[PDB]
Amino acid sequence: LGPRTEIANRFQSFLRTFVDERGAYTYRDRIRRMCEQNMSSFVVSYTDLANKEHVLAYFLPEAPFQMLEIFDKVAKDMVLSIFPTYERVTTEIHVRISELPLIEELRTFRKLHLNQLVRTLGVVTATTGVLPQLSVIKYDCVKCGYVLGPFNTEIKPGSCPECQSTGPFSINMEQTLYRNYQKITLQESPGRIPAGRIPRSKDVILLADLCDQCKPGDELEVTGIYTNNYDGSLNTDQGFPVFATVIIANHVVVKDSKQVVQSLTDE
Amino acid sequence: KDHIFPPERVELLQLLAKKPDIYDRLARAIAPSIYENDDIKKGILLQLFGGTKKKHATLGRQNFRSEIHLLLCGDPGTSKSQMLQYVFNLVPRSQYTSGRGSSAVGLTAYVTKDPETRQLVLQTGALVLADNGVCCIDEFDKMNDSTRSVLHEVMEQQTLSIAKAGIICQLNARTSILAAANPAESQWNKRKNIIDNVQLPHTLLSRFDLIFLVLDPQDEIFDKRLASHLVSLYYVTRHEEEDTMFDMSVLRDYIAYAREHLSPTLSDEAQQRLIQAYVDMRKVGAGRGQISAYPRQLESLIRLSEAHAKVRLSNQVELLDVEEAWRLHREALKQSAT
Ligand SMILES: Nc1ncnc2c1ncn2[C@@H]1O[C@H](COP(=O)(O)OP(=O)(O)O)[C@@H](O)[C@H]1O
């Protein structure tokens, strides 16, 4: 498209046009800094985005999924083009955000905060362990013995090597890509309570690049995005439909910082 | 509203009221036939005639209620549990648990699960159900130390405020106490005053209004009169309307009607006597480990005063009441002259 191409192109004319710190801007070199160490967790500044092009605040909330995807395509087509040897280790990228002009306390968010940009914090409690997931749709045809091909929703087209036939199928335990997974339980601090009552909480999902980072009993900072479980069994109802809530993780900052930590000025 | 009377009953009511004998008639007529220690029920009528209302719609200050509490304590042979199970069959808002009947939590905040909602609930108490009423209590000195610092809150603030992981609550509750404590023995020990006998502090013992001492009649002579009269009581199995005319229910409205249309007030009467004699009444500095008179007595005294002025329905204060109030006090305030 004409305008709907300009996003990645403005990222391209961003990471070698916007400058701070007396030349040799970070993201000219931060990306190769990270491709060296084989990390694949590049991070963005929002304030730098406001310094260069303030357009990217209204264009975002209408579907930030697509914003993040159109982000990651740029990191791919940059890195794997300029480091073509790289295409061995992970071959997938996404980016992070760590600058938001707002800290939304718990017990403050409602349906108005649906599917858009967030910041929130709190405390961890008990949650699950570490498990992997699926990533791709591939089956094995069972009438004719072929594979249907590569393709929260099912697809199942009639087109396939078996003369576009074989509604039936079966599945292997290999040749399909996987994805690490973990859950969390976010509870608010027992300092900033309404002074003596039960607290409130939500669940949160984090994804494969972000695991074995959190822990029970810790301090926290997350951007997150507000989810919507699309149906907890709509039917004859209670005095409420049985609906639920999660936030999906984009980027964490921990507050303890128990490692060698700060990024480096040029001088 | 469901008990408002006709004016015809006012005839018999005020007819009872018109005689000084009324101070003794009802005191005689509480019990079925128990005709000993009638010197005390004449004070219990001051709780049956349940106190005065110096209301506090005026300035919001100090919540000085006509706070009345009086207790009895002595041997288990005296019919305290029996008399008070009968008093349960007298008082409207009759509650009756007792010392080691239920704990503090056993008296407040019966918080637990219910299958009806099938959900956890912040829930009920016991005292607060009897607001302005009574709870007859027995065998007091068996209760846990967690309890009996609860009653300090009510008796000395007349309030309640509650806070658990669920609700925080500021309810309302207030009432007058009765109770029937017992010692750790069968008999109160002579040469060992109540100042240390029963299990309470050095000055919170006397902190109630006045504990009307009770004990077995240490006299074989009295045994025959009751062993005859109160077995003939069974043997005939009905009653007789003698000089102390028992009214079947018309007595009960003189109790009922006389909470509402009355407002005792002081002109000049029940202040000046101790205001005069305070020097020798307040030379109380002397004593080795004792307890005695303090400048709270006159609060309780004005309470008892306007109480006994309520009976006879004297809208202005009674002056005779002061005399039997002094009698009430010095009946048991030097039981430790020692
Ligand atoms: N003056 C009295 N009038 C009536 N009953 C009395 C009197 N003195 C002793 N009793 C006896 O006391 C018993 C009631 O005592 P109760 O109050 O139950 O003891 P406790 O309170 O220690 O359990 C009655 O069975 C009665 O026979």
Scanning the structure block, which residue is given the tokens 């309307």? B241
Chain breaks in chain A (C to N over 2.5 A) after: 151
Are the C-beta atoms of A125 and A216 separated by less than 8 Å?
yes
DSSP result, B312-329: TT-SBPPSTHHHHHHHHH
Residues 6+ away with beta carbon under 8 Å from B59: none
Stated length of chain B = 338
Cα(B96)–Cα(B138) distance, integer angstroms? 8
Asked if the Cβ–Cβ distance from B163 to A198 is below 8 Å, we say: no
> Has B76 been labeled as part of a binding site?
yes
Helices A26-37/A64-82 angle, 10° precision: 70
Cα(B266)–Cα(B321) distance, integer angstroms? 12
Testing ligand 1's pocket by substitution, the residue of B39, B82, B220, B230 carrying the most ligand atoms inside 8 A of its CB is B82
Q: Is B117 helix (H, G, I), strand (E, B) or coil?
A: coil
CA B270 vs CA A146, B56, B293, B327: distances in Å:
110, 21, 18, 14
CA A182 vs CA A153, A213, B205, B296: distances in Å:
21, 11, 64, 68
CA B30 vs CA A144, A210, B231: distances in Å:
102, 81, 19
Q: Within an 8 Å CB–CB cutoff, is residue B168 touching chain A?
A: yes
Asked if the Cβ–Cβ distance from A196 to B166 is below 8 Å, we say: no
Q: Is A221 helix (H, G, I), strand (E, B) or coil?
A: coil
> Has B74 been labeled as part of a binding site?
yes
| CA quadruple B259, B260, B266, B269: dihedral sign | negative
Shortest alpha-carbon distance between residue B111 and chain A (Å): 16
Burial string for B124-157 (b: 16+ CB within 10 Å, else e) reads ebbbbebeebbbbbbbbbebeeebbebbeebeee
* Residues of B with Cβ-Cβ distance to A198 under 8 angstroms: 165-166
Return the number of CB contacts < 8 Å for A and B. 5
* Residues of A with Cβ-Cβ distance to B166 under 8 angstroms: 198
Shortest alpha-carbon distance between residue B166 and chain A (Å): 6
What the block records as the tokens of B123 is: 């829930």
CB A69: neighbour CB atoms within 10 A?
11
DSSP result, B33-97: S--S-HHHHHHHHHHHTT-------SS--TT-----B--EE--SSSSHHHHHHHHHTT-TTEEE-
Find the largest Cα–Cα distance for chain A.
68
> Has B209 been labeled as part of a binding site?
no
Asked if the Cβ–Cβ distance from B166 to A198 is below 8 Å, we say: yes
Are the C-beta atoms of B176 and B131 separated by less than 8 Å?
no
Please tell me the experimental approach by which this structure was elucidated. Answer: cryo-EM
> Has B292 been labeled as part of a binding site?
no
Query: How many angstroms is it from B23 CA to the middle of ligand 1?
Result: 25
Cα(A222)–Cα(B115) distance, integer angstroms? 40
- Give strand ranges (E) for B110-239: 110-114, 119-124, 134-136, 161-163, 168-170, 212-213
Cα(A265)–Cα(A24) distance, integer angstroms? 11
> Which H or E run contains A187?
strand A178-187
CB B22: neighbour CB atoms within 10 A?
17
Burial string for A160-199 (b: 16+ CB within 10 Å, else e) reads bebeeebeeeeeeeeeeeeeebbbbbbbbeeeeeeeeeee
Shortest alpha-carbon distance between residue A175 and chain B (Å): 49
Rounded (to 5) percent helix, strand, coil in chain B: 30, 10, 60
Query: How many angstroms is it from B229 CA to the middle of ligand 1?
Result: 15
CA Rg value for chain A: 22
In chain A, residues 179-208 whose CB comes closer than 8 Å to chain B: 196-198
Q: Write the DSSP symbol of residue B21.
A: T
Cα(B209)–Cα(B206) distance, integer angstroms? 7
* Residues of A with Cβ-Cβ distance to B168 under 8 angstroms: 196
Shortest alpha-carbon distance between residue A237 and chain B (Å): 17
Q: Is B4 helix (H, G, I), strand (E, B) or coil?
A: coil
HSE of A121 in the Cβ direction (CA atoms, 13 Å)?
15
Query: How many angstroms is it from B246 CA to the middle of ligand 1?
Result: 23
Helices B22-29/B38-48 angle, 10° precision: 100
Are the C-beta atoms of A150 and A132 separated by less than 8 Å?
no
Asked if the Cβ–Cβ distance from A198 to B168 is below 8 Å, we say: no
Are the C-beta atoms of B167 and B122 separated by less than 8 Å?
yes
* Residues of B with Cβ-Cβ distance to A238 under 8 angstroms: none
* Residues of B with Cβ-Cβ distance to A196 under 8 angstroms: 163, 168
Cα(B329)–Cα(B43) distance, integer angstroms? 11
Pocket flag, ligand 1, residue B37 (CB < 6 Å)? no
> Which H or E run contains A182?
strand A178-187
